[PDB]
Design a protein around this ligand. Structure first.
Ligand SMILES: [Zn+2]
Lengths: 53, 39, 53, 39
DNA sequence: CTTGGCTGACGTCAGCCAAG
DNA sequence: CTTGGCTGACGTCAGCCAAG
C-alpha cells in the first residue's frame, strides 16, 4: 500500500504545480488590470483638475 | 492567508471583480459630469 | 568534477527558490499597494463629482 | 518577460515607484482644487 | 559553436490543518 | 486524537539564452 501511497503523492504534486503557476498568472493579470485602472483614474483626475482652470 | 491555491485564486478574482465593478460604475458618470460642469 | 558539477546546481536551486518566493511576495505587495491607490482615487473621484451637485 | 527573477523584481519595483510617484504628485493638489472650486 | 548561470518540471519527504 | 489533502523545501535532470 506504500506504492500507491507514493503514487497519489506524485499525482498530487502535478496538480499543485498547475495551481501554483495558474495562481501566479492570475496575480500578474490582476497587476496589469490594476495598472490600467490606475492610469485611467489618474488621467481623469488630471482632466477634472484642469476643468477648474 | 489560506494555503490552498483555489482559495487564493478565488480571493483575487472576487476582489478583482468587485474593484472592477466599482471602477466601471464610477467611470459611467463623466459625461454628465462635464455636461453639468459647463452650465 | 561531476560531483562539484552537481554541488553548484544544488546551491543554485536554493537561491532560485529564494528569489522565487521573494518575487511572489513582491507581486502581492504590489497588488495591495495598487488596491489602496485604486480605492483612494475612486473615493476622490466620487468627492469631486459630488462637488458639482 | 525576462527569465531571471532579479529582472522581474526590478521591473515591478521600478514600475511601482513610477506609478507611486505620479499618484503622489496627483494627490498633492486637491486642497487648492477645493479652494479654487468654491470661489 | 560551446560553458555556465539560471530556471522550469519531476519526484520524495516532512508537515499542516481541517475532515473524518 | 488520527488519515488524508495539500503544500512548502530539497535534490536531480533537461534545457534556455546570453556570456565567454
Ligand atoms: Zn517549485
Amino acid at each position: 500500500k506504500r506504492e500507491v501511497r507514493l503514487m497519489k503523492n506524485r499525482e498530487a504534486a502535478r496538480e499543485s504545480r498547475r495551481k501554483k503557476k495558474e495562481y501566479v498568472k492570475c496575480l500578474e493579470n490582476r497587476v496589469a488590470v490594476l495598472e490600467n485602472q490606475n492610469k485611467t483614474l489618474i488621467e481623469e483626475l488630471k482632466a477634472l483638475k484642469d476643468l477648474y482652470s | 492567508n489560506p494555503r490552498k491555491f483555489s482559495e487564493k485564486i478565488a480571493l483575487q478574482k472576487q476582489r478583482q471583480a468587485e474593484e472592477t465593478a466599482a471602477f466601471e460604475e464610477v467611470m459611467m458618470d463623466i459625461g454628465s459630469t462635464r455636461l453639468q460642469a459647463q452650465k
